Amino acid sequence: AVMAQEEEDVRDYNLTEEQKAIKAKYPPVNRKYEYLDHTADVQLHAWGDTLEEAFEQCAMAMFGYMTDTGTVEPLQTVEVETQGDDLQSLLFHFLDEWLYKFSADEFFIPREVKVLSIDQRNFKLRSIGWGEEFSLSKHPQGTEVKAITYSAMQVYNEENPEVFVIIDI
Amino acid sequence: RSYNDELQFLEKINKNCWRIKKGFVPNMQVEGVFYVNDALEKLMFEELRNACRGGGVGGFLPAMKQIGNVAALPGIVHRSIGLPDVHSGYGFAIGNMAAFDMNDPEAVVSPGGVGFDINCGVRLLRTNLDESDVQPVKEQLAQAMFDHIPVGVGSKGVIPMNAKDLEEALEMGVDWSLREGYAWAEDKEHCEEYGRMLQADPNKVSARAKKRGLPQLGTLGAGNHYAEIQVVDEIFNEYAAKKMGIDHKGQVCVMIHSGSRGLGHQVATDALVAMEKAMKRDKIIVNDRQLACARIASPEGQDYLKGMAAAGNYAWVNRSSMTFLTRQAFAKVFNTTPDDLDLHVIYDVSHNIAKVEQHVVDGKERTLLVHRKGSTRAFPPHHPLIAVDYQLTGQPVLIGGTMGTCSYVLTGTEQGMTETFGTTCHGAGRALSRAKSRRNLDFQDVLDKLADMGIAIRVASPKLVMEEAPESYKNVTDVVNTCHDAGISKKAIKLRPIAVIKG
Ligand SMILES: *P(=O)(O)OC[C@H]1O[C@@H](n2cnc3c(=O)[nH]c(N)nc32)[C@H](O)[C@@H]1O
Ligand SMILES: [Mn+2]
Ligand SMILES: [Mn+2]
């Protein structure tokens, strides 16, 4: 099933040859997301075969807006557990915790995120991501993400799960 | 609803203003209005039609719906007002103002409505240099700006900062920059709020916000943020320009746009989470979850406002850092001290902040909490909250256009104080989303046209510059003309970019 609502437009991060070489030696990340129309910012639209994958693709969509995540090497693994009062706040806090992993402490960016579990009875989540510290000498500059917003946030938990999140840039 | 069924709530009040009537969205306490002339009108109605076109999934809320949703917040007085830069945001519309009666016990404060870039602002600097002095060294100057000012994601401040320095900057604002020698006393005098909000409490700023803000203090940011060398092209009000130090067409100015960075983003994020928790206790009905709010006197409301003020002091410290680095770059290129170059602050004015202000509502003076999202103060002549040098001209207004068109300086008016609670805009606003700009524009076409215009550019990612192209924003002249013809701001100066750095 085609879940993209737009034709594919891949953002170009002006890769150096060394960065192109770093990306060339790892398996390509499967991308199930797209950046949609929002007048002031950008709407993340991500999907998967499970709700877990729809969440992890949204996180990868968020990190894919900051840089070319294909240039990120899997040198370290980081855990993100969070909870909410419903799927929307679980999604909000899931993306917010990952944004915080990137924005403080160890300044970590994953090349891939995997959601290991979503407790839908208590709205809890376990996820991991592998990558390295973000470095301007190693990774290209995309767009900085300011925050996660609830604007027009949509979580669909049926046969082909998908989410829509507007993030502040 | 169908597009035609939506228009039944829309009336043109006058040549430059539209009315959004009650019932457009549920539970509107007051009507909505937005100020647009002929050119800006189509962009606003096309957003209503095309934001959620289909009957399925996806889409976003157009700005008219967000203006109406804001009109449903408890305690709002007069109107939910969209300023000429209005377009869809994430809670409030961008360019959306709302004031709340602080003596109404149901009045709320909306941190998700104020915005995540708390106290983001525009600072205009002047020089005694002319364009003829800069053109021989234009590309060198743009590079010097790029080398001095860190921009883009992952950037960190060049001057080392520790936690105590951040704690003092949260409390003192520009007073910290003055104490450490990064600012001049004249900068504070011509800065809004004198560059410091006294009720800021660093204890209301989370450890997470401080951990995010510490490396990013001294960085410009990304997105709409810019540092731009400009040239005066036209002086509509010589008296106001003379008070601002602008003497002649051809004079070089520098316009800087930056905010509270990750600290302010986290402060807003932390507050929104607290409001959601508080709404389980006191259940306030809001049409949009981003508008999660609490009563102003609530512990959540008071804690947010005190942390918001600290984030505002952070933004003033950051813009002082941008000014200090701008002065260093000009000094290196021209081998002249910044004082000898007259690199003084004309004004610093902010958006994305809530302020306690005195306003007359239906003949009675009232104390209001004025939310301004993507919109700024435009205080009239003889206002007590305006520096002495602008008591007679009115408050300076800074409207940045794009890196390839124009920017304007205006002055607040008495009619703006009456109609919009002294609110105007900070820029043109977007006409195309970033995603739609990619489909319509090519990065090489944008770079080449800017070079053909003699504009020097240094950006963090040149192959994404189409998302920030001049064609992506409204015509700034139409926005400025709407403010002028509506009487909510008065044209003073027209500026033209010659060099811009962006992240
Ligand atoms: P607010 O919603 O923060 O938007 C800021 C405002 O600034 C203007 N803008 C965007 N890029 C530039 C630039 O390179 N130079 C100038 N002078 N102004 C710029 C837009 O109008 C935007 O709406
Ligand atoms: Mn934004
Ligand atoms: Mn801004």
Residue numbers in the entry:
A (entry chain B): 11 to 179
B (entry chain A): 3 to 505
Article, verbatim:
To obtain a structure of the RTCB-Archease complex in the post-activation state (i.e., with the activated RTCB-GMP intermediate), we co-crystallized RTCB with Archease in the presence of the nucleotide co-factor GTP, and Mn2+ ions. The nucleotide co-factor GTP reacted with the active site histidine H428 to form the guanylylated RTCB-H428-GMP intermediate via a phosphoramidate bond (right). Our structures confirm the previously identified residues involved in base and sugar binding. The position of the covalent bond at the α-phosphate was inverted due to the phosphoryl transfer reaction (compare left to right panel in Fig. 4c and Supplementary Fig. 4h), while the coordination of one of the α-phosphate oxygens to Mn2+(A) remained unaffected. With its additional ligands from RTCB side-chains C122, H259 and H353 as well as a water molecule, Mn2+(A) shows a square pyramidal coordination. The Mn2+(C) site is occupied and coordinated octahedrally as in the GMPCPP structure. In addition to metal coordination, the phosphate molecule is bound by RTCB residues D119, N354 and K375, and Archease residues K156 and D178.
RNA ligases of the RTCB-type play an essential role in tRNA splicing, the unfolded protein response and RNA repair. This active site guanylylation reaction relies on the activation factor Archease.
